[PDB]
Amino acid sequence: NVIVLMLP
Amino acid sequence: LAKNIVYVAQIKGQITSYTYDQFDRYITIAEQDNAEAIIIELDTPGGRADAMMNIVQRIQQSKIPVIIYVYPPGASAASAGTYIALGSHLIAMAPGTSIGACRPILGYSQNGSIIEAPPAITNYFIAYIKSLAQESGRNATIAEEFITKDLSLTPEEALKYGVIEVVARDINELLKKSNGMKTKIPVNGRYVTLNFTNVEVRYLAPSFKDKLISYITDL
Amino acid sequence: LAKNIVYVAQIKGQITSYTYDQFDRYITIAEQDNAEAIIIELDTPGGRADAMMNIVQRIQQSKIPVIIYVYPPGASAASAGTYIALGSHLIAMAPGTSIGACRPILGYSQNGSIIEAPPAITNYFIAYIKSLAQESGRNATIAEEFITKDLSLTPEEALKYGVIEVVARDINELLKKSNGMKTKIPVNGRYVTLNFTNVEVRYLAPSFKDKLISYITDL
Ligand SMILES: [Cl-]
């Protein structure tokens, strides 16, 4: 259960 | 005739779980007091996708209008903050603020480097941001470019391109200009007309937990 | 200057940006001290992909061997911790620990419901985990199954399946068993034979900031 995302 | 209650909260920094908690806390308070609207003074450089989506979802379920106000001058609603804006009932921006710049990445590396997002993720967020723009009648074409071209916009640009509804210097001007505006998304199934004639402004303080987390962040 | 030194540090909780900083701080100390190795006692239930990838990178670039030790009994290197393990010079597991369950997710809904990733991003993390395993000569079939089957393994299983190199109850047993072993990845371009005879063991205390930030992320 690795949490994937952020954004720039 | 009637006295309309408007709440005003500040939400600052990276979008995380604690941010969701702030959105949930401040919105719940406004709902229980039968508020006309809650305004959120938002300043964010970005943050986590799941929390962002949870915030958009919390805003959809809201029993009162949520106005996202990019404030103060110098603030931005970049990356995750843009989706929150687009997912809300009305967007305002103060002079000298920014919206857009939403090209997803897996994250930043040690030496300034950026870990690329696989195309699927990119396409997934394109569809999501277009959807939010479509559902709220905002410019989906431009919203896509927030991702595909890392497009960022001034308030005057954002209004002209039909991404936001209001350019305002303070809470006073915001209420004045947004009075009589229909919300861009429904509140419980119907599109509410905002009544800001005879308004009581109430400011919500951040909680101890809010302040602690952010002071740690400031280091 | 003519000493054989092994540093031991502790890393507990969610793998985040701050966990990166910890790995970097501990590894840097050991590098500047010309340590024979650093042993990282790891207990993590989950974490973020970007921090995970930065940690793996930092381990790949380490000037000394990094030994990932799933410790104490009851610890797990689940989710992001598994990648960190597979990305390192040697993996040890204490009796009663766990490794695996690495399915990538977009995160958690308001419910606590699982927000799954698009199928293609599952394939991206499959490629990534297979790469780590084949670069370190470890069982990439089983590694793939950490994702596709949410597969989790006990120490003895992980050993039998060629995913880890050591099962050890404590640091002293770890040193005794791993002594003479080649690292599974290079240190500065060369595979290295661990020399743990006549070794001085130095424990690096987690700082107040480490314990506090961990405790806060906990709740
Ligand atoms: Cl050697």
Residue numbers in the entry:
A (entry chain C): 234 to 241
B (entry chain B), C (entry chain A): 19 to 237
Question: What does the primary publication say about this deposited structure?
Answer:
1510-N is a thermostable protease, and the elevated activity was observed with temperatures from 323 to 371 K. Thus, we presume that heat treatment is a good candidate for approaching the second catalytic step of 1510-N. The protein–peptide complex was heated at 353 K for 10 min, and then crystallization trials were performed. Using the heat-treatment complex of 1510-N K138A and 234P10 peptide, crystals were obtained under the condition similar to that of the no heat-treatment complex obtained previously, and the structure was determined. The structure with heat treatment determined here is fitted to the structure with no heat-treatment determined previously, resulting in a low root-mean-square (r.m.s.) difference of 0.15 Å for Cα atoms of the 1510-N dimer, and 0.40 Å for all atoms of the peptide. The result indicates that the structure with heat treatment is almost identical to that with no heat-treatment. The N-terminal half of the peptide (234NVIVL238) shows clear electron densities, whereas the C-terminal half of the peptide (239MLP241) shows weak densities. Almost all the main-chain nitrogen and carboxyl oxygen atoms of 234NVIVL238 are hydrogen-bonded to the protease. The main-chain atoms of 239MLP241 have fewer hydrogen bonds than 234NVIVL238. According to the superposition between the structures with heat-treatment and with no heat-treatment, the 234NVIVL238 peptide is superposed well, whereas the 239MLP241 peptide is slightly deviated. According to the results of hydrogen bonds and superposition, the N-terminal half of the peptide binds to 1510-N more tightly than the C-terminal half of the peptide. The two catalytic Ala138 residues that replaced Lys are located very close together.
The N-terminal region of STOPP PH1510p (residues 16–236, 1510-N) is a thermostable serine protease with a catalytic Ser–Lys dyad (Ser97 and Lys138), and specifically cleaves the C-terminal hydrophobic region of the p-stomatin PH1511p (235VIVL↓MLPM242 in which the arrow indicates the point cleaved). Membrane-bound proteases play several important roles in protein quality control and regulation. In both archaeal and bacterial species, p-stomatin and STOPP (stomatin operon partner protein) genes probably form an operon. The flexible L2 loops of 1510-N cover the peptide, and are involved in the protease activity.
